[PDB]
Structures are given as C-alpha cells and as structure tokens.
Amino acid sequence: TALVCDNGSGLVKAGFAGDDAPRAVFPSIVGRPKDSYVGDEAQSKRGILTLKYPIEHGIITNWDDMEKIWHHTFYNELRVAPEEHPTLLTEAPLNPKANREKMTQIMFETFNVPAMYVAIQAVLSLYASGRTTGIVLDSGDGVTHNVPIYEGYALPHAIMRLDLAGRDLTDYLMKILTERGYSFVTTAEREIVRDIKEKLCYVALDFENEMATAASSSSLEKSYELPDGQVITIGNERFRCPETLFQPSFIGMESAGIHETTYNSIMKCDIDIRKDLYANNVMSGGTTMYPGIADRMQKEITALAPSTMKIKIIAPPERKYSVWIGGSILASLSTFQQMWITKQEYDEAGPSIVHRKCF
Amino acid sequence: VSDEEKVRIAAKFITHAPPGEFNEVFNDVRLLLNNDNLLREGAAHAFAQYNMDQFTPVKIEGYEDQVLITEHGDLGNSRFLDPRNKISFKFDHLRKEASDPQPEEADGGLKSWRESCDSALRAYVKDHYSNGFCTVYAKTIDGQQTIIACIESHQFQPKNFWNGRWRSEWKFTITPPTAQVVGVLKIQVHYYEDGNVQLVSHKDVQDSLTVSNEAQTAKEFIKIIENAENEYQTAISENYQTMSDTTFKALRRQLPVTRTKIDWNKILSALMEVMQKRSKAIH
Amino acid sequence: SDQQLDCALDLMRRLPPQQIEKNLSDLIDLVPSLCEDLLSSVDQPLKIARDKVVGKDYLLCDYNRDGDSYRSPWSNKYDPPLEDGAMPSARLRKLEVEANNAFDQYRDLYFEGGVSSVYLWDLDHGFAGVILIKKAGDGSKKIKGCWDSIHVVEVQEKSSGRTAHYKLTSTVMLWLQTNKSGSGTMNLGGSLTRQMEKDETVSDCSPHIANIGRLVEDMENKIRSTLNEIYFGKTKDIVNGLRSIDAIPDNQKFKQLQRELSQVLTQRQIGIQL
Ligand SMILES: Nc1ncnc2c1ncn2[C@@H]1O[C@H](COP(=O)(O)OP(=O)(O)O)[C@@H](O)[C@H]1O
Numbered sequence: 060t061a062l063v064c065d066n067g068s069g070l071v072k073a074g075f076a077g078d079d080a081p082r083a084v085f086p087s088i089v090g091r092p093k094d095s096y097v098g099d100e101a102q103s104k105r106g107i108l109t110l111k112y113p114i115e116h117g118i119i120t121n122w123d124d125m126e127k128i129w130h131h132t133f134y135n136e137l138r139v140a141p142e143e144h145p146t147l148l149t150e151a152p153l154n155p156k157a158n159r160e161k162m163t164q165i166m167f168e169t170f171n172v173p174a175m176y177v178a179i180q181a182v183l184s185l186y187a188s189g190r191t192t193g194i195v196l197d198s199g200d201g202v203t204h205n206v207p208i209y210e211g212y213a214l215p216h217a218i219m220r221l222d223l224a225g226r227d228l229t230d231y232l233m234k235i236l237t238e239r240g241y242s243f244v245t246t247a248e249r250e251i252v253r254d255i256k257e258k259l260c261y262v263a264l265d266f267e268n269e270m271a272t273a274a275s276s277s278s279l280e281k282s283y284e285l286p287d288g289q290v291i292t293i294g295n296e297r298f299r300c301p302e303t304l305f306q307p308s309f310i311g312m313e314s315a316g317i318h319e320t321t322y323n324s325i326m327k328c329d330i331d332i333r334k335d336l337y338a339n340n341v342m343s344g345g346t347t348m349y350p351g352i353a354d355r356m357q358k359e360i361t362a363l364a365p366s367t368m369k370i371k372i373i374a375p376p377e378r379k380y381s382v383w384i385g386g387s388i389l390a391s392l393s394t395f396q397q398m399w400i401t402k403q404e405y406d407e408a409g410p411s412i413v414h415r416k417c418f
Numbered sequence: 419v420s421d422e423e424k425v426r427i428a429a430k431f432i433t434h435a436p437p438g439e440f441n442e443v444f445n446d447v448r449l450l451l452n453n454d455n456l457l458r459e460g461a462a463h464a465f466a467q468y469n470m471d472q473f474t475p476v477k478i479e480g481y482e483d484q485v486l487i488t489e490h491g492d493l494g495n496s497r498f499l500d501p502r503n504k505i506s507f508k509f510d511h512l513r514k515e516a517s518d519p520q521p522e523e524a525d526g527g528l529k530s531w532r533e534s535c536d537s538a539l540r541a542y543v544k545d546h547y548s549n550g551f552c553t554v555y556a557k558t559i560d561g562q563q564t565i566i567a568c569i570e571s572h573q574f575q576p577k578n579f580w581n582g583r584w585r586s587e588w589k590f591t592i593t594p595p596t597a598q599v600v601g602v603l604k605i606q607v608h609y610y611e612d613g614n615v616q617l618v619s620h621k622d623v624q625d626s627l628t629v630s631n632e633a634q635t636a637k638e639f640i641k642i643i644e645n646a647e648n649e650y651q652t653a654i655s656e657n658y659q660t661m662s663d664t665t666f667k668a669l670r671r672q673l674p675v676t677r678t679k680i681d682w683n684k685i686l687s688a689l690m691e692v693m694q695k696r697s698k699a700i701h
Numbered sequence: 702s703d704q705q706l707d708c709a710l711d712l713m714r715r716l717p718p719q720q721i722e723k724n725l726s727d728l729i730d731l732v733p734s735l736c737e738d739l740l741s742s743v744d745q746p747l748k749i750a751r752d753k754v755v756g757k758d759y760l761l762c763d764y765n766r767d768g769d770s771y772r773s774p775w776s777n778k779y780d781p782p783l784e785d786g787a788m789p790s791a792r793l794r795k796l797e798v799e800a801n802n803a804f805d806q807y808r809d810l811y812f813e814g815g816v817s818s819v820y821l822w823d824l825d826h827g828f829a830g831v832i833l834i835k836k837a838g839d840g841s842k843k844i845k846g847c848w849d850s851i852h853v854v855e856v857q858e859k860s861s862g863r864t865a866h867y868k869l870t871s872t873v874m875l876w877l878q879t880n881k882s883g884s885g886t887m888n889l890g891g892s893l894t895r896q897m898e899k900d901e902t903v904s905d906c907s908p909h910i911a912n913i914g915r916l917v918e919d920m921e922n923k924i925r926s927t928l929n930e931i932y933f934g935k936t937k938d939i940v941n942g943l944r945s946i947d948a949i950p951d952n953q954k955f956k957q958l959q960r961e962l963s964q965v966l967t968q969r970q971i972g973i974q975l
C-alpha cells in the first residue's frame with residue numbers, strides 16, 4: 060500500500076496506492092506568528108499569521124518549511140508511521156541535480172523510509188492517460204511545461220518552460236475587476252476572486268467576434284453570489300482572462316503562447332516519431348479545466364501543421380488529479396519490487412547513494 | 419580541359435568528402451568523369467587515403483570482432499595488421515572484400531605493455547560510450563617503442579537526415595626517466611533537414627605525469643585521458659550554452675537595445691541642444 | 702540532359718561553406734555548357750565594390766547587371782558611361798532614395814555596421830525588388846564570421862481596395878568560428894531559404910516601403926531564432942549522444958528490466974483500457 064505524495068506549488072496531494080482518488084488534498088502554505096500552523100488552520104487565522112509559500116515555480120526554495128509540510132503530511136493527514144512501507148515522490152523536470160538528493164538526505168535523517176522511486180511529474184501522466192508515447196503539458200499553478208516522452212524516457216534537450224500559470228491569471232482577473240467598479244483589494248479577498256475563475260470563465264475561437272458579440276448584445280452576463288448577500292453581474296472578462304495563455308502580451312511577457320510552444324516541442328525531435336506524437340497530445344494539470352480549451356488547440360494547430368496528416372488531441376475528465384493516479388498505478392505493479400532506491404543500498408554504501416544511483 | 423587537372427580535382431573533392439557517406443559522392447564523381455579506366459588507378463590513392471583518415475571499422479569474416487584502420491598503425495602495404503589474434507588481412511578500399519588468411523609474427527619485446535593497454539582502454543571504452551570502437555597498436559620508431567591508442571564512434575542514420583562521428587588518437591612513449599602524453603581529438607556532425615549545417619572541431623593536447631611500474635602503468639594515462647575528455651565536454655557545452663550573448667551577438671542581435679520591434683512609421687518620418695545647459699547647471 | 706545539373710546541385714550542398722567560392726571556380730572547370738545556368742540557381746557569396754564619386758562601398762549582384770555593366774544604387778552610373786539605358790521608373794526614383802537611406806538606419810539598430818543595398822525592377826503589373834545585406838567579422842574581435850542575406854520581393858496588381866499581396870522569398874548564409882584554448886577550434890556553418898505571402902492595406906501613413914521593412918525585419922528575426930534554436934540546437938544533442946558525460950554501467954544493469962517493464966505495461970494497458 061505505497062504512499063503517493065505528489066508535491067505542487069498550489070495544492071499538495073497525498074494518499075495510498077490502492078485507491079483511485081487522493082485522500083488528502085490541502086494547500087501548501089506555511090504561516091508564522093504556535094509555529095506549526097500549516098494548511099487550513101493557517102488560512103483561518105489570517106489576521107495574525109504572516110503566510111509564506113515554501114515551494115516557488117516548481118523548485119523548493121525554503122527547505123525548513125518544506126520539512127514542516129512533509130511532517131504535517133505524515134502525521135495529521137494520514138495518521139500512519141513514516142517507516143511502515145515505501146513512499147513515492149515527484150519533482151518537476153529541469154531541476155538542479157543536487158536538489159534531487161537534498162530531499163533524500165533530509166528524508167532519511169528524520170523518517171528513514173524503506174525505499175524511494177523519485178521520478179518526474181510528467182512521465183507518469185502519460186501512463187495515466189493509458190499510453191507510453193506523447194506530448195505532455197504541466198499547465199499547473201507555478202509553472203507550465205511542454206515535455207515530450209517516447210517509450211517512457213524524458214528527453215532533456217526537447218522541453219520548454221513558461222512562467223505563465225494560474226496565479227498570474229488570477230492577478231490579471233483582479234486587475235480587470237477593479238476597472239468595472241467592484242473593487243477587490245488586499246490578499247484576504249483572493250480566495251473569492253479565484254472562485255469566479257473556476258465556474259465563470261471559458262475560451263472562445265473568434266477572440267474578436269466574441270468581443271464584438273459581448274459588447275453589442277448583453278446576453279453574455281452572469282450573476283454571482285458573493286458570501287455577503289451581494290450579487291455581482293459580470294460581463295466581458297469571462298473570456299479575457301483565459302486568453303492570456305494564448306497571448307501573453309496582455310500581462311506584458313513577450314514569450315509565446317501555449318499554442319506555438321507545442322509546435323516548437325515537436326520541431327526539436329526526429330522525423331520518424333512525429334507521426335506518433337501528433338496522434339496523442341495529452342493535457343494535464345489544474346489550469347486546463349476550462350470548457351472548450353480542446354477546440355481552440357485543435358483549430359490553432361491545424362492552421363500551423365502540414366495539411367497532409369491528422370492531429371488528434373484528447374483529454375480525460377479527471378485531468379486535475381492525473382498526476383496522483385498515474386503514480387498509484389505505477390507504485391503497485393508486479394515487476395516493480397526489484398528496482399527501488401531501497402534502504403539497504405544506503406545502509407551498505409553509507410552517504411554515497413547521493414552521487415551513484417541517479418538513474 | 420586537361421585530364422590530370424580533372425583527376426586531381428576529383429582527388430581533392432573526395433579528400434574533403436562529406437561526413438561519412440561514400441556511395442552517393444562516388445556515383446556522382448563517376449557521372450561527371452568519362453574515363454573510368456583512369457578513375458580506377460588515378461583515384462585509387464584518394465579513396466585509400468579517405469579510408470585511412472576516417473578510421474572506418476571493418477567486420478572480419480566471423481571471428482566475432484571488428485577492427486579499425488589507422489594511418490599510423492596499419493602495416494602500410496596492400497595487406498594490413500591487427501592488434502589481436504595474430505592474423506594480417508587485406509582490406510579492399512571499395513568493395514570491402516575479406517581475404518589473406520596468413521598470420522604474422524609480433525616483436526614480443528613489450529607485449530605485456532600493449533596487452534595491458536588493450537585491457538585498460540577496453541574497460542573505459544565500453545561503459546563510458548553509448549556505442550564506440552577502439553584499437554591499440556605498438557611499434558618501434560627511431561629505436562623507441564610507441565603505443566598508439568585510437569578511438570572512433572559513429573551514429574550513421576540516412577532516413578532522419580543527420581550524420582555524426584567522433585575520432586581521437588593518443589600517443590604513449592617508453593621513457594623511464596619521464597613519460598609524455600600526446601592527444602588529438604576531432605568531431606564532425608552534419609544536419610541537412612531542409613537546410614545545411616556543418617560542424618567541424620579539432621583539438622590537440624600535450625601533457626605528462628610521473629613514471630610507474632607495470633602494476634600501475636595501465637592507470638595514469640587512462641586517468642589523464644578521462645580528465646581531458648571530461649574537461650573538453652565541459653568546455654564545449656559551457657561555450658555553446660552562451661552562444662546567443664557572447665559570440666553570436668557580434669554577427670547579429672536578437673532584438674535591439676529597445677527590446678521592441680523598430681517603429682517604421684517614425685523612422686520614415688532642437689530639444690537636445692537646449693537640454694545641455696540644464697544638464698550642466700543641475701549636475 | 703537534366704540529371705547532370707541536379708547532380709551538380711547535389712554536389713553543391715554537400716561541400717562545407719567556407720571555401721565554396723573556390724569550388725565555384727572548380728565548377729566551371731568541370732562542365733562548361735552548364736556554367737551559366739547554374740549561377741542562376743546556386744546562391745553565391747556576394748562581392749563588394751567601391752563608388753568613386755561618393756566614397757562608399759556597395760554590393761554587386763546578378764540582376765543589376767546588363768552586358769557586364771553594373772549600376773550603383775546611390776549614384777546612377779555604369780562602367781561604360783552613357784552606353785545603355787540606366788535606372789528607369791523616375792516615379793520610383795524617390796522610392797529608392799528613401800529606401801537606400803531607410804534600411805541603413807535599420808543597419809544601425811541591429812548589426813551596428815555592415816553594408817546594404819536595394820534595387821527595384823519594372824514589370825507588366827506592378828514591380829519587383831532585390832535586397833542585399835552583408836556583414837563581415839570584426840578585425841579587433843577574436844570572432845571572425847560572415848552573414849549574407851538575399852531577399853526577393855514581388856507585388857501583384859489589385860484593381861481596388863488598396864490591398865497588396867507581398868510575396869517575399871529570402872535566403873541566408875552564415876559562417877562562424879571559435880578558437881578558444883579550452884575547446885581548441887570549432888566551426889559552424891549554415892544555409893537556409895524560405896518564402897511567404899501576405900495581404901495588407903495601402904495607406905498614406907503606412908506606404909509600401911513601411912510594409913517591405915516590416916516583412917524584411919520579421920523574416921530576419923524569425924530565421925535567426927529558427928536557425929539558432931531548432932537547427933543548431935540538436936547538434937549539441939548529437940555530440941552528447943556520441944558520449945555521455947558520466948560513466949553509465951548503472952543503466953545497462955537495469956535496461957533488461959526496463960524492457961520487461963515496457964512489455965508488461967503494454968500488456969496491462971490493453972488489459973484494462975480504462
Ligand atoms: N475548477 C478549476 N477551474 C480552473 N482552474 C482551476 C480549477 N481548480 C483549480 N484551478 C487552478 O489550478 C491551480 C492548481 O493547480 P495545481 O494542479 O495544484 O498545480 P500543481 O499541482 O502543479 O501545484 C489553482 O491555483 C487554480 O488557480
């Protein structure tokens with residue numbers, strides 16, 4: 060019953076192997092004025108605690124607070140002893156190599172788990188979809204990636220990184236909302252302006268035609284119940300927020316959108332694998348829930364690929380937790396028993412596994 | 419058009435032949451030339467030299483091994499020499515024919531040294547390469563024994579449209595007073611997917627370390643070689659990663675200083691004079 | 702009759718760039734009958750000439766030549782003076798005068814040097830144009846490279862709407878070398894050619910040459926980034942694939958287990974299939 064404990068910049072996930080849903084999903088945020096206030100209790104007492112994020116942009120910056128998060132994960136959320144059974148962990152691609160083992164040594168120094176299979180986040184989402192070959196988008200909370208995978212191997216020379224993610228979109232939505240008249244100020248009112256983003260945002264094909272229709276006919280208006288008794292009618296930002304991914308010049312970044320980088324991902328690859336890689340582009344992450352985001356990609360790529368072949372783009376319904384399930388279907392498998400980063404290797408070789416078993 | 423001019427023109431064409439493919443260039447130089455009878459012998463030395471320089475491998479008739487061809491290591495006559503198994507062979511420059519089942523006789527003066535060289539080079543030629551082949555030769559030049567260690571690796575693929583080759587050679591001398599190490603490296607890669615890209619690189623290194631006995635002599639040059647190669651890869655990767663801001667900005671910038679597209683309307687279509695007095699008085 | 706010229710073109714792309722002009726000489730030694738027509742096919746590095754009346758250099762080309770007599774873009778002249786018609790389309794004269802000025806202001810913002818030239822044509826319905834840019838390596842700087850680029854522009858007629866279809870073809874030659882002590886000598890070369898077509902309106906605020914400058918600058922930026930990232934990029938992949946930086950006995954120990962893992966996963970995915 061292996062533990063899958065998927066880290067993340069927004070919301071940390073933890074659970075057992077046999078289940079098909081993450082049992083413990085809680086925010087990864089640490090407050091300071093007791094000192095051990097992490098998670099929902101940290102959010103509740105916002106009037107005294109100076110909240111701060113340990114993880115930033117997919118690379119662990121502060122290490123003590125990440126240790127506190129790991130301690131809270133294995134004590135209150137799961138209520139199990141650390142060393143009962145192996146634990147699996149994940150880290151984003153394009154990381155400092157020493158940071159892979161910097162967490163291994165602090166894990167053994169306080170938990171001494173029986174084994175590890177520290178792996179990439181994107182290599183297993185493709186397995187969760189159900190295949191071994193394809194392109195993957197880690198459109199998450201801190202960063203976005205384009206990562207091709209062929210036969211289970213991650214090519215380090217063919218990945219791309221984008222800074223645009225959910226938090227920038229939420230900040231932009233706040234900026235647009237200030238202009239209408241309903242001013243939202245300070246960080247306490249973030250959790251509600253995120254809520255408008257979840258269930259009142261979508262994408263449109265004709266960005267200009269949609270703007271013309273919204274400005275002319277006031278049928279694209281929706282009412283939202285704030286938790287005060289007030290009701291806010293919201294109009295034209297229902298498509299001006301998610302379009303920032305396809306045109307980053309709105310915020311100011313000169314980087315390309317997430318629709319040209321899927322092209323550069325596969326230009327930097329062999330001739331013979333492209334027929335395989337167009338056929339299966341797999342979505343993932345928390346920031347790809349919006350309705351109709353498959354159709355915009357299907358229309359944009361067809362205008363930029365050769366017209367002599369077929370592009371099929373797919374997405375499961377359970378895109379948000381696809382990293383967790385893909386771990387749990389890999390941790391519990393028949394021939395998986397023999398290749399772990401087991402404890403006896405560290406016990407025999409002493410502090411030498413940190414530069415030997417890097418595979 | 420003088421005939422011998424044409425012959426030597428084909429000779430220096432094939433001398434600078436592209437990275438690895440020989441059949442297409444051979445067919446086309448056959449096409450341009452009319453006197454194939456003169457091509458048989460007036461281009462034999464050029465094709466032979468191309469085989470000598472490239473360090474090509476050849477798979478022998480079923481002794482479960484393949485061997486390289488070295489300019490400084492082969493026998494030199496029509497029939498060449500091998501390090502292992504004591505069987506000289508005749509290798510055709512064009513048809514890759516296998517013949518000459520006639521052994522020969524080694525000097526035997528320092529066979530332990532060359533055997534240890536083979537055994538040590540083998541160990542860090544297998545694991546540290548993805549796919550490569552090596553050879554080691556020993557010969558007496560000017561009354562002094564010299565050991566030449568040669569390494570070659572190729573990744574030929576026509577359908578993907580790229581070619582690549584690594585070649586390297588190292589010299590070792592027998593001087594109990596003080597040893598000396600000479601090394602030469604070269605890289606050749608070619609990419610032609612709807613374009614042209616060539617990359618040629620060469621390097622030479624001179625270094626040395628203390629002498630040692632037979633139990634230890636198989637390790638010092640191996641360590642020197644591995645250190646030199648690793649530092650070379652570090653150097654080329656470090657220089658390549660900073661291409662867009664160190665060496666490539668001299669030819670052309672990515673964007674101008676303004677970090678924006680040039681505004682052609684204002685380019686198509688005195689404040690500075692007056693502002694100088696303000697700049698003087700204030701500062 | 703037609704295969705030999707294709708074979709000559711095949712030979713042309715095969716040789717390295719840094720001495721191709723010598724090969725061009727060698728080319729005219731091999732087959733004299735096809736010496737003229739191949740020059741119209743194969744792009745060549747361009748030559749630099751000097752104007753005597755203004756004291757500045759310009760760029761020789763193929764399509765500003767008639768009877769072995771060239772024209773300077775700045776001062777209308779020929780080596781045989783007043784023996785043939787020179788620089789037609791006086792209404793286009795002004796549209797050269799700005800243009801010869803205009804693109805050198807573009808030289809000053811990107812290259813910080815180099816030499817440029819533009820020559821326009823006449824044709825039945827509209828006009829055409831040929832634009833040249835050359836940049837040589839700096840003498841003081843250790844790096845010694847060369848950039849050449851040729852552009853051909855065509856515009857079709859339109860009866861009304863003030864919308865013009867510009868067709869732009871472009872070709873770039875690039876050569877770079879480094880001689881740093883750490884890595885010895887390294888050389889890089891490149892040749893590329895592309896086309897595109899675009900429709901855009903004609904306005905008093907935005908004349909034709911503004912659009913031509915837009916297309917030229919966009920093509921050059923796109924080709925620069927494309928050649929840097931996609932083409933030159935995976936040479937690093939090939940050289941790092943020839944040998945790994947670290948020793949790898951470890952992956953070979955578990956490679957057979959990886960193959961068995963792939964086999965059983967391929968079985969299992971079909972086994973459940975959601
Ligand atoms: N239903 C939803 N619709 C749209 N966006 C959502 C939804 N739920 C969460 N998000 C966004 O996704 C983010 C969470 O991303 P996540 O998948 O946790 O990234 P990571 O796991 O890499 O940290 C949140 O910050 C939020 O902005």
Ligand SMILES: [Mg+2]
Binds near residue numbers: 068
């Ligand atoms: Mg995530």
